[PDB]
Amino acid sequence: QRANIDFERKGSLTLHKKKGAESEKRATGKEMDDVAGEPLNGVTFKITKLNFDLQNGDWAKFPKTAADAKGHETSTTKEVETSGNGTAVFDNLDLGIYLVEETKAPDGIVTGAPFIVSIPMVNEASDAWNYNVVAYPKNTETKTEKTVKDADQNIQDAYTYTIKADAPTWGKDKKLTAFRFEDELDKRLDFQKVTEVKAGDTVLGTSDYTVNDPATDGNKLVVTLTDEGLKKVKSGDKMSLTFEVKRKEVGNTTELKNRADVIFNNPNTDKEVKNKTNEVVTYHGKLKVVKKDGKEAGKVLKGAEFELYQCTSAAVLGKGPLTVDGVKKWTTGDDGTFTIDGLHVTDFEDGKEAAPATKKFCLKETKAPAGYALPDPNVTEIEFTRAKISEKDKFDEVTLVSEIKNIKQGT
Ligand SMILES: [Ca+2]
């Protein structure tokens, strides 16, 4: 039998796309059953026939890497997306040298580097020519998540944001050359400090990263890893950033949203990868108290003193007197009112619906205006929920108003 190449034959390329760690094992070009990772559907591959002649050209001069292929591209191309078991088949292929590139991939996928394939090929000199080439390209799934720890933290109380992100994987020629966290903070927020930067289970020191100054940087936070920092990062490590903030005021809406970004190099293609987190929400509103004379019609009262408590009901006071923005006692003004700017809603915390919505606020009247008796009970429980603060009474959307009555002493 002849061992020659049959140039009246047509070849094929079969890609078995995998989600996982790179193959530092040079592939046979034949079937391998290397299901180390999970099959990845949705990745598109583009093959490009190169000018090189297998029939009459010098094979010693043929490209062996994606870099050597540059400048030898032809108009003959084909695009296929992975479908069943993360498989893309390129059929009725003219014999020749092809460049294989990833054109599209799903969200969070860090693609592998482009590669070169010969149709036909041999793994070993003793093998028969192989016209049906099989390759196992690799990819890495990198997820980015944002959480908020803001339970019982009112206006000017420090609360934290935490950004979690999967670092990419890198081969032994390849490396992680850049890695940063970006977060555009709402104008109502004041950055406090970065509390923790973690690479896997390794808590980094302040020499391993840099912090910009959000106040003079349009309220945008940037936390970049230095050269020292990067050295501590291992392939595919779970990166973490916890930083502290204070909400200055309630503002125009009860809700305050946060979303962040992670930017790193693709170790294989060296091109920048931006990854965006989910959006998290913190809710605060204002509490307005109006002191009224119970028996004397349409009359407000100056000089009524109050304290604020956490409570399950008016008969059962919890934490308090509470300090909200350096004040732990409020007195009604010349208009018979005061406004606490502001408090954490009782029905939504740490980024989710409160379970159970048992928390309430309690106003304790500590002193009645001159010539007025101290009401009994002197405690008013408040259902400070998003829905109740949202109600309007033109007689607003971010303020909940509480009417409290006092009666003149003696009679
Ligand atoms: Ca309201």
Author numbering: 42 to 436, 440 to 455
Question: What are the paper's exact sentences on this?
Answer:
SpaD, the subject of this report, is the major pilin protein that forms the polymeric backbone, or shaft, of one of the three types of pilus expressed by the human pathogen C. diphtheriae. SpaD is an elongated molecule of ∼125 Å in length built from three tandem domains with Ig-type folds. As in some of the other Gram-positive major pilins, these three domains comprise a single CnaA-type domain flanked by two CnaB-type domains. Two crystal structures, of the full-length three-domain protein at 2.5 Å resolution and of a two-domain (D2-D3) construct at 1.87 Å resolution, show that each of the three Ig-like domains contains a single Lys–Asn isopeptide-bond cross-link, assumed to give mechanical stability as in other such pili.
After testing several different constructs of SpaD, we were able to obtain diffraction-quality crystals from a construct containing residues 27–455, comprising most of the mature full-length SpaD but lacking the C-terminal sortase motif residues. Improved crystals of the full-length native SpaD were then obtained by cryocooling the crystals under high pressure, which enabled data processing to 2.5 Å resolution. The structure was solved by molecular replacement using the structure of the truncated form (SeMet SpaDtryp) as a search model. In the final model, one protomer is complete apart from residues 27–41 (the N-terminus) and 437–439, whereas in the other a large loop between residues 63 and 76, smaller loops between residues 212 and 214 and residues 435 and 436, and the C-­terminal residues 454–455 could not be modelled owing to insufficient density. The angular ‘bend’ between the D1 and D2/D3 domains differs in the two molecules of the asymmetric unit, however. Aside from this, the two copies of SpaD in the asymmetric unit are very similar, with r.m.s.d.s of 0.28 Å between the two D1 domains over 126 Cα atoms and of 0.51 Å between the two D2/D3 domain pairs over 264 Cα atoms. Interpretation of the electron density showed the clear presence of three isopeptide bonds in the structure of SpaD, cross-linking the first and last β-strands of the CnaB-type domains D1 and D3 and the first and second-last strands of the CnaA-type D2 domain. The isopeptide bonds link Lys58 and Asn180 in the D1 domain, Lys187 and Asn299 in the D2 domain and Lys332 and Asn450 in the D3 domain with the essential catalytic acids provided by Glu143, Asp224 and Glu406, respectively. The protein crystals used in the structure determination were from freshly purified SpaD and the three isopeptide bonds seen in the structure must have fully formed during the time taken for crystallization (one to three weeks at 18°C). In our SpaD crystal structure the pilin molecules are stacked end-to-end, bringing the C-terminus of one molecule close to a groove in the N-terminal domain of the next.
